[PDB]
């Protein structure tokens, strides 16, 4: 994984808050996933804040979701939200020496989960882009204005990028539109059969499924059952598509025993029936599917009442190549070395997409 520090601007820490990141002169959070929040509520950091003034920068939506959780509220006076595509000047103060450094940061949508951004940094040590976690369609980098000067791609020294699926194995992954379309039609065909036909969307406990929930709710006029929606209380574009009311045909609720429940025709929220009549439940499990270069269906049946539906939080190998090729940075560094590859193989895929 990425240890928080870009070589070009090492006095700021991104998506990593422990060890050497404890001495950072400014903090950045790309998005509100635990993989990118290590040490963020470490007592040693709660104290290092109080002893003097360092800030955490992030998207307005990221600030809302972060400050919703009780454990992070100590950040409240120390978070500065930056609007999307708004170049902003930040002052970095060396505590020991009193030296001031000036950097500009620009937040670009990363298409990962709500509030997820890339950080574009400009200053004395070159231009660098930290992608965080990102899913962008092929051709999307050419349509980002603030990666351009006078219709020309900006001169970028280093791109630090989401290499979750950086291998030709994950050559092609269906778009979020194709994924949504597949889920929409499976759900539609099921819940229109009668009022006792309900869907359980088996989703991990992590932001990034809302796009699914909000679009199912618009097209079908049915709110999605969730354990908690208070994180979205000041976000009407999401909130109004969700409910804590169990009386709905679409559930994204969660329970430790959800699997044994489903076996007994019980939703995680513990209902088996409506007006004494047992419900008809299908499970749909969003899960990453991929296709090799020289090798179909986003919906896979797994049982009489169970389905896997293609869904990805990270770009395909093809989408990585497209993004990085277009930017043609001097350097490209992987934010992650997945379990099934190595630094040398990922560098071997990245180096040819760089300048020279
Ligand atoms: Zn993530
Ligand atoms: Zn439920």
State the distance from the centre of ligand 2 to the C-alpha of 233, rounded, in angstroms. Answer: 19
State the distance from the centre of ligand 2 to the C-alpha of 250, rounded, in angstroms. Answer: 8
- The answer to whether 335 and 163 have CB atoms below 8 angstroms apart is yes
Whether 87 and 124 map to the same domain: the answer is yes
Whether 160 and 95 map to the same domain: the answer is yes
Whether 201 and 87 map to the same domain: the answer is no
Residue with tokens 């991990």: 204
Tokens of 90: 């930040």
Ligand nearest to the CA of 225: 2
> ∠ CA 313-36-83 to the nearest 5 degrees?
80
State the distance from the centre of ligand 1 to the C-alpha of 24, rounded, in angstroms. Answer: 22
SS3 169: helix
Whether 321 and 274 map to the same domain: the answer is no
HSE-up (13 A, CA, CB side) for residue 52: 2
Alpha helices, DSSP H, located in 155-209 = 176-191
Whether 111 and 206 map to the same domain: the answer is no
Whether 336 and 224 map to the same domain: the answer is no
Tokens of 249: 């045909």
> ∠ CA 310-293-165 to the nearest 5 degrees?
55
- Please name every residue paired with 109 in a beta bridge, in sequence order, or none if there are none: 117
Return the percent helix, strand and coil in the chain, to nearest 5: 30, 25, 45
Resolution, expressed in angstroms to one decimal: 2.4
Method: X-ray
State the distance from the centre of ligand 2 to the C-alpha of 246, rounded, in angstroms. Answer: 5
Q: How many angstroms separate the first and last alpha carbons of the chain?
A: 27
State the distance from the centre of ligand 1 to the C-alpha of 134, rounded, in angstroms. Answer: 8
**Domains of the chain: total:** 2
Whether 109 and 159 map to the same domain: the answer is yes
Supply the CATH number for residue 345's domain.
3.60.15.10
Whether 149 and 1 map to the same domain: the answer is yes
Long-range contacts of 76-80 (CB under 8 A, 24+ apart): 78/49, 78/53, 78/54, 79/55, 80/55, 80/56
Residue with tokens 């749909």: 284
- Residue 188: CB atoms within 10 A of its CB come to 14
Whether 327 and 310 map to the same domain: the answer is no
State the distance from the centre of ligand 2 to the C-alpha of 300, rounded, in angstroms. Answer: 23
State the distance from the centre of ligand 2 to the C-alpha of 303, rounded, in angstroms. Answer: 21
State the distance from the centre of ligand 2 to the C-alpha of 181, rounded, in angstroms. Answer: 22
State the distance from the centre of ligand 1 to the C-alpha of 33, rounded, in angstroms. Answer: 5
- Residue 206: CB atoms within 10 A of its CB come to 12
Ligand nearest to the CA of 200: 2
Closest listed residue to residue 30, CA positions, set 43, 40, 22, 20: 40
Distance CA 129, CA 110 (A): 12
Ligand nearest to the CA of 134: 1
Ligand nearest to the CA of 164: 1
Ligand nearest to the CA of 268: 2
* Angle (deg, nearest 10), helices 343-350 and 317-327: 50
Whether 71 and 112 map to the same domain: the answer is yes
SS3 75: helix
- The answer to whether 225 and 246 have CB atoms below 8 angstroms apart is yes
Distance CA 229, CA 225 (A): 9
**β-sheet with 100-109: strand ranges across:** 88-93, 100-109, 117-122, 128-132, 158-161, 331-334
Burial 214-246 (b: 16+ CB within 10 A, else e): bbbbeebebbbbbeebebbeebeebbebbbeee
State the distance from the centre of ligand 2 to the C-alpha of 7, rounded, in angstroms. Answer: 47
Tokens of 155: 């001169």
Whether 115 and 186 map to the same domain: the answer is no
Whether 117 and 250 map to the same domain: the answer is no
Q: What domain range includes position 43?
A: 1-170+315-356
DSSP 9: S
């Amino acid at each position: 994984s990425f240890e928080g520090q870009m070589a070009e601007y090492p006095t700021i820490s991104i998506d990593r808050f422990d060890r050497e990141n404890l001495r950072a002169r400014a903090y950045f959070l790309s998005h509100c996933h635990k993989d990118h929040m290590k040490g963020l509520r470490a007592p040693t950091l709660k104290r290092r804040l109080e002893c003097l003034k360092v800030y955490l920068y992030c998207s307005p939506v990221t600030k809302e979701l972060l400050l919703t959780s009780p454990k992070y509220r100590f950040w409240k006076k120390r978070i500065i939200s930056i609007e999307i595509e708004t170049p902003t000047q930040i002052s970095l103060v060396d505590e020991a020496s009193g030296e001031k450094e000036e950097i500009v940061v620009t937040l670009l949508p990363a298409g990962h989960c709500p509030g997820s951004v890339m950080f574009l940094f400009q200053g004395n040590n070159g231009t660098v882009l930290y992608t965080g976690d990102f899913r962008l369609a092929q051709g999307e980098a050419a349509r980002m204005e603030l990666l351009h000067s006078g219709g020309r791609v900006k001169d970028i020294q280093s791109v630090y990028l989401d290499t979750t699926f950086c291998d030709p194995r994950f050559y092609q992954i269906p778009s979020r539109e194709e994924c949504l379309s597949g889920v929409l039609e499976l759900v539609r065909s099921w819940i229109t059969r009668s009022p006792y036909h309900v869907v359980w969307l088996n989703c991990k406990a992590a932001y990034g499924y809302e796009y699914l929930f909000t679009n199912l709710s618009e097209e079908l006029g049915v709110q999605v059952h969730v354990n908690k929606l208070d994180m979205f209380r000041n976000m009407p574009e999401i909130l109004h598509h969700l409910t804590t009311d169990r009386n709905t045909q679409i559930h994204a609720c969660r329970h430790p025993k959800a699997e044994e429940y489903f076996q007994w025709s019980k939703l995680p929220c513990g209902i088996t029936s409506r007006n004494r009549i047992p419900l008809h439940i299908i499970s749909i499990k969003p899960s990453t599917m991929w296709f090799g270069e020289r090798s179909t269906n986003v919906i896979v049946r797994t049982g009489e009442s169970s389905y896997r539906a293609c869904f990805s939080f990270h770009s395909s190998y093809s989408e990585i190549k497209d993004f990085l090729s277009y930017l043609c940075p001097v350097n490209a560094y992987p934010n992650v070395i997945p379990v099934g590859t190595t630094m040398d193989k990922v560098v071997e895929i990245l180096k040819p997409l760089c300048r020279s």
